[PDB]
Design a binder for this molecule. Structure first.
Ligand SMILES: C[C@]12CCC(=O)C[C@@H]1CC[C@@H]1[C@@H]2CC[C@]2(C)[C@@H](O)CC[C@@H]12
Ligand SMILES: [Li+]
Length: 245
């Protein structure tokens, strides 16, 4: 099982947010900390993606683009997973030093988004998702959002995505019905996209007004959110869904 060996080997470790838990919870502090966490995790997601089987088959411009479009969904999905394994989805485990209870969900003014994310975390429990399933699903999320007009070399992308789908199917097949399970997992993967879209909308709006509300955006975050995220929100870049929405 070369493929699973690899996904397991490359899986990023713990990333902390740098949040000061001594200071009262305020919108500005929580969101600055989440933004900082995003920047730190972005560094890990890039090194992760670059080490994925076949990823170097993509054109270099496409390597960068798939990361830039998919990071939100990937980070939300992994955060769901950590919340499940650490808090049993009772709280959102963004980082060891940044765990949201209901009060912080309220204070972050992202309560409805946090509800959807906690629901995804709950699905990990409800569907009894295995770590191997999680790892393959996560890899497939990197290949789940692309420009409507296609990438630089779409053929390389299509083939890579195909290979990852096949890998998910094998993992299900190697389990003690297959069809139900595949249906369940593709439905779960689809459910990440609407959550990612609401956070895309939220973060874009926040960047625009960030001076006003004293929320800090680090450099990579500000740039992707103003350059790449608007492509998604304007419909130039769209998620690939398994099932019809
Ligand atoms: C991806 C992050 C940070 C990484 C993580 O664990 C999930 C989480 C989901 C909400 C995001 C946050 C990064 C910063 C964002 C985008 C804020 O600007 C508003 C929503 C935040
Ligand atoms: Li705090």
């Amino acid at each position: 099982p070369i493929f699973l060996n690899v996904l397991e080997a490359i899986e990023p470790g713990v990333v902390c947010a740098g949040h000061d838990n001594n200071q009262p919870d305020s919108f500005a502090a929580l969101l600055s900390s989440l933004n900082e966490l995003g920047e730190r995790q972005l560094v890990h997601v890039v090194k992760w993606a670059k080490a994925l089987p076949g990823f170097r088959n993509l054109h270099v411009d496409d390597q960068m683009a798939v990361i830039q479009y998919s990071w939100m969904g990937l980070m939300v999905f992994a955060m769901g997973w950590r919340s499940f394994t650490n808090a049993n989805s009772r709280m959102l485990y963004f980082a060891p030093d940044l765990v949201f209870n209901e009060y912080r969900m309220h204070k972050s003014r992202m309560y409805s988004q946090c509800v959807r994310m906690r629901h995804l975390s709950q699905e990990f429990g409800w569907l009894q998702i295995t770590p191997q399933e999680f790892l393959c699903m996560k890899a497939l999320l990197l290949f789940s959002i692309i420009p409507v007009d296609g990438l630089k070399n779409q053929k390389f992308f299509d083939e890579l995505r195909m290979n990852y789908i096949k890998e998910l199917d094998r993992i299900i097949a190697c389990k003690r019905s297959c069809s139900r399970r595949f249906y369940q997992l593709t439905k779960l993967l689809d459910s990440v996209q609407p959550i990612a879209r609401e956070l895309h909308q939220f973060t874009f709006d926040l960047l625009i007004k960030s001076h006003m509300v004293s929320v800090d955006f680090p450099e990579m975050m500000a740039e992707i959110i103003s350059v790449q995220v608007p492509k998604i929100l304007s419909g130039k870049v769209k998620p690939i869904y398994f099932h019809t929405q």
